[PDB]
């Protein structure tokens, strides 16, 4: 029931993605590629941000605190099984990929299978379904 602060802003810019001024904080971070729900809840919990703030008052320090949490999730006691790339078939590292880096790794995987000339690679090249369907 707090009055609008006149500093309320729309399309909050974060991680090179426009994030709606409305919507609760967990469901606004869901619009950043790689985060998704059930991860934005952990991000807000570990950044000390209430999940009932609706991005109306997201001061630059709070955005920076959020952005540094997602940058290194394991530094804030996020379990390894709670992550995007668990063991990285190429590098051999555990990390979380977000914000236009997941797509780059996706095209890296597709070309890696093509050079291998595995069955999954050739089916991807022809545009067919790679699972059993």
């Amino acid at each position: 029931l707090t009055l609008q602060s006149e500093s309320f802003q729309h399309i909050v810019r974060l991680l090179n993605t426009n994030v709606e001024g409305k919507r609760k904080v967990p469901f606004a971070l869901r619009m950043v590629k790689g985060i998704g729900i059930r991860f934005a809840y952990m991000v807000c919990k570990k950044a000390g941000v209430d999940v009932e703030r609706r991005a109306g008052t997201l001061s630059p320090e709070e955005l920076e605190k959020i952005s540094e949490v997602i940058a290194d999730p394991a530094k804030f006691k996020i379990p390894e099984w709670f992550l995007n790339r668990q063991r990285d078939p190429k590098t051999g590292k555990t990390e979380h990929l977000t914000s236009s880096m997941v797509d780059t790794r996706l095209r890296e995987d597709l070309e890696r299978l093509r050079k291998i000339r595995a069955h999954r690679g050739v089916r991807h090249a022809y545009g067919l379904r790679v699972r059993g369907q």
Binding site: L128, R129, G132, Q133
Partner: peptide, 4 residues
């Protein structure tokens, strides 16, 4: 399987 595939249908389309």
């Amino acid at each position: 399987h595939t249908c389309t």
